[PDB]
Amino acid sequence: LAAAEASLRDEIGPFIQLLLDRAEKHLDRQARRIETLKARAELNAGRLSQ
Amino acid sequence: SPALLARVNEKKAELENLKELRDLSAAVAAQMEALEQKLSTLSSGTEAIATVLANWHNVLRAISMASAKIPPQTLVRIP
């Protein structure tokens, strides 16, 4: 499996770029979720103060 | 007429011979069927020894892959 997966998965090398793009988009998605969470937190603070 | 009586006697002998030939031909074909069964059994034994070569062939290749290590997991198949 060492040399087998090495040669095979290296030939799979173009496919994995999409997997990298997936992980990167997952990060960006949760980043926008963090932005929405911050919006909710500040919204609660401002509305409670009002 | 009497010559023809002798002719039918000749034909009687011929028919007896023909009946024996027919019986023999039937027996022949029966033996061919039996032969085919035995040959099938032979081929089965040969297939068994082919299985034996498959064992040692996989052995040799498995070792050579380990022997040729010149720079993993435990997932295998256990039937």
Chain A nearest-CA residue for B71? A3
What Å resolution does this PDB entry report?
A: 4.5
Let me know: does B72 contact A2? Beta carbons within 8 Å: yes
A2 chain-B contacts, CB cut-off 8 A: 72
Query: In Å, how far is B61's CA from the nearest CA of chain A?
Result: 14
Chain B nearest-CA residue for A2? B72
Instruction: Tell me the C-alpha distance between B49 and B55, whole Å.
Output: 10
What are the CB-based long-range contacts (under 8 Å, 24+) for B50-54?
none
Going by C-alpha positions, the residue among A4, A47, A35 that lies closest to residue B65 is A4
Residues 10-69 of B with CB under 8 A from A: 65
Let me know: does B66 contact A4? Beta carbons within 8 Å: no
Instruction: Tell me the C-alpha distance between B23 and B28, whole Å.
Output: 9
What residue type is assigned to position B1 of the chain?
S
Instruction: Tell me the C-alpha distance between B18 and B11, whole Å.
Output: 10
DSSP letter at A13 equals: T
